[PDB]
């Protein structure tokens, strides 16, 4: 089959900088490319059909060129809402085949997170487990450490960390972190802190509650 | 202005049969410059085309999966479906169903996707746990905890509070079972007079709930 080779895989580029994505063929497929977008949790959405003609509705600042086995994709000043990951799709004799992607992610100022902790609800300790969660908002970059700290204890291997995708709007990142205890270890101890070093920050910053108050 | 929406099971056992479908609103299936396809995504990979199907019913397959894929079309309920057979794991996917032009490689509309699970597991509601907040600007949240399998849909308000909402990935816990938090941040000055309720459906369970976070 007819194989799309899409580069690069990932890239990082400043607002209004030009970002530029090549797309291979393995042999012509004269102009039967098309070129898509796909935000996060949503549908890929055609950005350009026949390798150079922009889609209804698209803005101008995106273009396709090419024809043949060499592909383009290019947006002239990228903008915030456009962090995706685009797709090169061929359907030259009725085969069709994707590109394997490429991660377009928004290079921005440092932002320190926003930490919040959450304590355990009162109907869960019904169940027999306790949950702690911490929240870090709004940060840039993604690299971030977060520790637990029970009593002042470090904790290791009993909690999980989720981090949502660069923002559309502020090309920030939002992270999560759920300690997870049982109930007879929840009510042994009295401080439960969460600690966060991030670049943003002149130096860690704890926030903690009392179990109670 | 022409829409698609996909129904079917999210959750198949091994062996077993996927079975989608796609209907068409807003238009009609029946037209002879449009094929309708089906296109899925593995979670965390790329895009790969099933097949399509033309009103008249004359269809393209993707040769990797013709043995075991049907797409038949109902031009009298404006339908299109889809059949794999004998899925396994690395059939767990989220299928689309999109329009087509041919040539141009042209697929405009899209389905929502339809997250689809492999797996002989057993279907488990979630649980759902206030994230209290405890304080200019408050964080409070909904902890949803111990379901499967993927996915669960949050929103606050019934959709009418966006602003500020992070809906974080969700989780895969030792158990196997998934859990993840909704969190946003409001203004401190709104919490004893605005109510803030988080609502969690998981279609798998036909399970949907609504908490109330309230200041503990």
Known sequence: ?213 | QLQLQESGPGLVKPSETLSLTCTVSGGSISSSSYYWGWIRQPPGKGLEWIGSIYYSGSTYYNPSLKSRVTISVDTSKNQFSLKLSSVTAADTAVYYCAREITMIAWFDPWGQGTLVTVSSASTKGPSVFPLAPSSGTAALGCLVKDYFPEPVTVSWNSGALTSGVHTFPAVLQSSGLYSLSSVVTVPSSSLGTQTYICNVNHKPSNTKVDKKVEPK
């Open chain 1, 1 to 213: 089959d007819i194989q799309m080779t899409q580069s690069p895989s990932s890239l990082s580029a400043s607002v209004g900088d030009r970002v530029t994505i090549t797309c291979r063929a393995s042999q012509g497929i004269r102009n039967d490319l098309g070129w898509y977008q796909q935000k996060p949790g949503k549908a890929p959405k055609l950005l350009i059909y026949a390798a150079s003609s922009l889609q209804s509705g698209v803005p101008s600042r995106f273009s396709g060129s090419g024809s043949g086995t060499d592909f383009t994709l290019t947006i002239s000043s990228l903008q915030p809402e456009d962090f995706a990951t685009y797709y090169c799709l061929q359907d030259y004799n009725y085969l069709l085949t994707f590109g394997g992607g490429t991660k377009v992610e928004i290079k921005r100022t440092v932002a320190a997170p926003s930490v919040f902790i959450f304590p355990p609800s009162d109907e869960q300790l019904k169940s027999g487990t306790a949950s702690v969660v911490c929240l870090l908002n709004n940060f840039y970059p993604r690299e971030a450490k977060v520790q637990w700290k029970v009593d002042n204890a470090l904790q290791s291997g009993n909690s999980q960390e989720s981090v949502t995708e660069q923002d559309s709007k502020d090309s920030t990142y939002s992270l999560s972190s759920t300690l997870t205890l049982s109930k007879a270890d929840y009510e042994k101890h009295k401080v439960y802190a969460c600690e966060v070093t991030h670049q943003g920050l002149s130096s860690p910053v704890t926030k903690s509650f009392n179990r109670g108050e």
